[PDB]
Amino acid sequence: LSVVAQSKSDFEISDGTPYTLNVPLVGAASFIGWVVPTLLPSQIALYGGKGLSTAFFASIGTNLAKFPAPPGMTDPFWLLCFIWHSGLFATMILGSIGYNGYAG
Amino acid sequence: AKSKAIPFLDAPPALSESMPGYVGFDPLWVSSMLPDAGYVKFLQEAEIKHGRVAMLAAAGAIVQDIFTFPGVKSVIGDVKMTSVHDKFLSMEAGSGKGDMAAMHQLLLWLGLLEIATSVAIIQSFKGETSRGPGEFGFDPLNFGKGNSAGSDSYKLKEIKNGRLAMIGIGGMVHHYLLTGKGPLQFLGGIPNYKSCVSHPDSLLPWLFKAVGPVLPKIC
Amino acid sequence: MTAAYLPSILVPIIGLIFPGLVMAFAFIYIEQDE
Amino acid sequence: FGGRGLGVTVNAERWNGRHAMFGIFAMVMTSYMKGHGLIPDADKVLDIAQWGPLAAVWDGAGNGISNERAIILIAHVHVLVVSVIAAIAPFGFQDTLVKEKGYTPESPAGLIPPFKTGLTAEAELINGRLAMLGVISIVTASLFTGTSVVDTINLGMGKILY
Amino acid sequence: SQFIKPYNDDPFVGNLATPVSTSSFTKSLLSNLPAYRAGLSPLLRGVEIGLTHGYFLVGPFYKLGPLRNSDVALLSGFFSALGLIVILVACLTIYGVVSFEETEAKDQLQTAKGWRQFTSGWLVGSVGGASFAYILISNIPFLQTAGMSML
Amino acid sequence: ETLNLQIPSPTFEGSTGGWLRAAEVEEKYAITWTSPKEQVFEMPTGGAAIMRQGENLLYLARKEQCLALATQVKNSFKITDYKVYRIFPSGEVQYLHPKDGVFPEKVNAGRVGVGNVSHSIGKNLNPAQIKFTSKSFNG
Amino acid sequence: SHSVKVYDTCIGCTQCVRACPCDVLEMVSWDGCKAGQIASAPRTEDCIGCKRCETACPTDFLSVRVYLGGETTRSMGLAY
Amino acid sequence: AMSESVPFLKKPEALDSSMAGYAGFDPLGLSSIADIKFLQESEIKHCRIAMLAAAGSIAQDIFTFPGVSKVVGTAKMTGVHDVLVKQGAMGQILLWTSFLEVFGTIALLETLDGKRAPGDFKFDPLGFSKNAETAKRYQLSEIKNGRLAMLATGGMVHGYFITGKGPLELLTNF
């Protein structure tokens, strides 16, 4: 949140060009636009009957219960974490492109 | 321009005669070690902060020898003057294993206040504030009659009593570290090393390693 | 070995201090205008 | 270069003199200190298993530095660290080891400086010349007599120490 | 909109005004670092840089040095940090001797006196930060391991 | 004659190939020329710039960079109205090229020959005769 | 700097002057050759030592000879 | 220009006395990192959610709705969350509060642009703030109870993590 959507800060993306990073709207919209489709369940051993967002959030809670111990190599946490953040970063990139550039 | 405390020595350049608790005593010129404008201010706040903490510590040691609060005796047992610090820390999460957070709660709230005082010291160093050393505005009952900073005499009283308490709390700590008696037993027991209290090694025993084979070790 | 303390004294000095001193003073000498 | 107060100058004379006076004190103190056996485990040989190959000595028996040498070395490491910090970051009033090069040198004393019994520069220089002369004297006396330097100091001072 | 422009309005200087080079965040970080922060004497710049560098130097020597599996690992790591500090202070001093002519100006880093001040402060702060790291690691078992005491 | 410092420069987006710290502390070179058009050229230090109609001015770090651009403009756009200057950090400007108003490959009166040797190249002196002597090998 | 010489075998073809990237050479008047002109080297402080002049020269052994000498910022071709 | 709440610190620059609940409390300088209006909207949001959370804690001690004891046996404070994710309650409140948050996101963008006050959704059906003398009192009061409810919600849920009793049962069974 180096600059919000409103014309309030003076943050310049470069030396003399001010540019509104829309960090609240892009982060919120990209999160919801990635999490809501990702709720789609799947009877696969990695998901376990949940969606990718929900199985991922479940694996966060399971590994946080055993807080000092890290998840193992064969644990589903790493693959869930990778795919989730991969599609999340892709949706933030595409959302920032769409919102900042097309402006509507 | 000679100094009052030491007449033959030349007066320390950074110190000003307008600073409370000044008698021209700085032979090593620690006040000149940084060229900055607010280093003298920083050192003055340091001296006051060390003095106030030492005064609480000196009062605490005397009161702990007098009495203790209810229920403390059943947890800590017979530990006084820094042994109680180690004893609590043996029963606290993180440092030891137990159901207490006594030193940790003190660390938490003292550290919150002390990050606030950090911002005050940082602002006072760079001249952004016209606040003097030690003044945090804390004066709920009117003692300085309209200024929280107090009168020249009362800050001189504070600074001198702080210096006294630094010397005294150092004395009390080391006399305990070897006799094990604590303040009032040591002051009562003016013949000392004759019978001393068996007390635990501290969390820094190495410093008690030249007492035996190099220094005499009367105890 | 007789005077066996000598390698443990002289080898660190000859191998570290002597080059560190000649590098420092050679550096100063080769980069002075006068 | 050597116009920084280095070389055969009175600044170097004064600095070496101060070190020699501390050194005479340190030699007297270590002689007295090991005469009474107040250096702990002085004969105990340090193990390479704990300290690594820097402790090795290659004397035929034990093959390691003794604890007494290590303790004396650490004492001098304490004063070397103080020495470096005082050379590079000296006190405000302290006489500096390296001069500006635009400084005016102190006048050389001569055969004997004027006798000033205070905490003066004359007393410091007299005692410093005397201590440096003492350092060389003790070294040569110990070398020809065959005795160790500690025993030589004890005999020269008349066995007060031990 | 374009994010890459000539550096300081000059199209023919050998630099560009890119977001990494000249954004508000970069300028805030650069302007607030001790080397560039306003209102600091060179000695104080040296102290803050030294405290930082001396503090992190202790750790690699202690964890990965030759005596790491001994009980003198922290002692050897601190002393190794000290040895590096002394060598680096020698490097700073000889740089100052050969790079700056002697002038009265002392409040800038790139002057003879200003460099000598920065070197004095850097040595003091560096030994101070290494000493502080020694104290913290000596007393706290979490730091002695990599956090491995919790498992 | 002197460099009018106010001459607008060719439009350029900047590059890393331009001049460094030695230009503002040792010397910089400038080149000026007249263009009949607003046209694209290639900079000696990098990509493409656009010269403005009328008078242009550049700053380069090397004299050879000024002359490389000058040959490029003369062949590509038939522009010979180029003047190359040397500029010192004291502000003093030294006119360089063409040195006497006439290009070096065209003869001019009042040019004095420098470096001319009165014999052919094989008539030089062997090194041994001029050893421990200040006498030059060119006869 | 580098030292550049022009020997009297020069036929005045001007090829060295056109080939020089740093404007070291120029043409001066001389009655020795048919072309009536000889090369001259008045600005050898700018000579970088490229020897493009020597490549351009058509006399059997070169009328222009560059002798590489002391190095400077100019003769090293350093833009830094 | 010194902070009212913290007398030894300079008054925060981004903050102003026109703001409801203002006491000059920003010793860390977080009002400069993020935009102040985003921070106010965030604070008022947190305030209302924690006010509901604290009253819900107290009321779920005081009584339960008909048939609730059938579904939740012994689960008291956050155990009821765990058993009612199985049942449909948590998915339902999540869905409908997320529905409201969509228009809240539009309103947050609007208040960033500057058309709307933070936390202002024009929800005054009973016309409590119509006079406007009460409005300001209600504004400051809402911020104060919100802050108290944030601290209280934390302090009850952590009291329940310790004892398992829940707020009123912790008090009555000391």
Ligand code: CLA
């Ligand atoms: C992953 C999600 C996603 C995708 C696929 C798109 C795709 C698109 N958006 Mg949308 N957008 C998104 C998220 C996304 N957006 C979010 C979160 C926001 C809000 C912050 C917006 C806001 C927004 C606005 C305001 C506008 C768009 C517009 C567009 C279109 C062209 C511009 C563009 O971004 O080029 C993207 C180009 C493509 C996707 C096609 C190229 C094909 C390649 C293969 C791209 C693939 C990239 C990547 C691998 C796909 C990942 C998918 C998934 C696994 C994450 C395009 C159909 C504009 C438009 O045309 O209006 C309808 C427009 O006005 N978007």
Ligand code: CLA
């Ligand atoms: C963040 C707040 C929060 C959360 C997550 C929960 C979560 C839960 N509550 Mg608790 N509860 C809350 C607040 C909360 N409650 C409040 C505010 C009250 C009233 C003081 C209660 C009273 C309550 C009871 C009595 C019971 C629960 C129960 C439950 C469980 C099932 C849901 C249910 O039946 O709710 C029922 C809750 C309500 C009907 C209260 C809703 C209050 C609304 C939202 C206030 C908004 C009013 C306003 C006019 C609307 C304006 C909209 C605006 C945005 C424009 C569940 C674990 C049940 C359970 O299992 O307990 C063991 C149960 O029996 N809750």
Ligand SMILES: CC1=C(C#C/C(C)=C/C=C/C(C)=C/C=C/C=C(C)/C=C/C=C(\C)C#CC2=C(C)C[C@@H](O)CC2(C)C)C(C)(C)C[C@H](O)C1
């Ligand atoms: C400021 C402020 C306020 C406040 C407050 C408070 C809490 C103020 C506290 C003041 C205190 C606690 C002062 C204590 C000083 C102690 C000294 C000087 C003693 C040193 C010991 C010596 C020399 C010794 C010794 C010893 C030796 C070495 C050997 C030992 O074996 C024994 C022995 C003991 C003999 C209030 C709240 C009113 C508000 C107000 O508006 C602002």
Ligand SMILES: CC1=C(C#C/C(C)=C/C=C/C(C)=C/C=C/C=C(C)/C=C/C=C(C)/C=C/C2=C(C)CCCC2(C)C)C(C)(C)C[C@H](O)C1
């Ligand atoms: C909790 C904890 C512990 C602890 C602890 C604590 C609280 C330790 C505190 C230690 C302190 C404060 C020692 C003070 C020493 C003061 C001295 C030597 C004064 C010198 C003044 C002089 C010479 C004055 C000279 C002078 C006078 C007289 C007159 C002339 C002028 C002047 C030059 C000013 C541990 C570490 C033990 C371990 C334990 O497990 C955990």
Ligand SMILES: CC1=C(C#C/C(C)=C/C=C/C(C)=C/C=C/C=C(C)/C=C/C=C(C)/C=C/C2=C(C)CCCC2(C)C)C(C)(C)C[C@H](O)C1
């Ligand atoms: C994981 C879990 C769940 C849950 C859950 C929930 C509801 C979790 C909620 C957690 C909350 C709200 C924690 C709040 C803590 C407040 C703090 C630390 C403030 C301290 C105040 C300080 C430091 C100082 C304050 C102040 C004072 C005193 C003096 C200094 C100045 C000032 C700042 C004013 C579920 C629902 C899924 C169930 C599941 O079975 C388990």
Ligand code: SF4
């Ligand atoms: S060597 Fe290169 S620079 Fe020198 S005269 Fe010949 S062509 Fe010109």
Ligand code: SF4
């Ligand atoms: S030196 Fe060679 S190239 Fe140059 S003019 Fe003479 S003949 Fe032509």
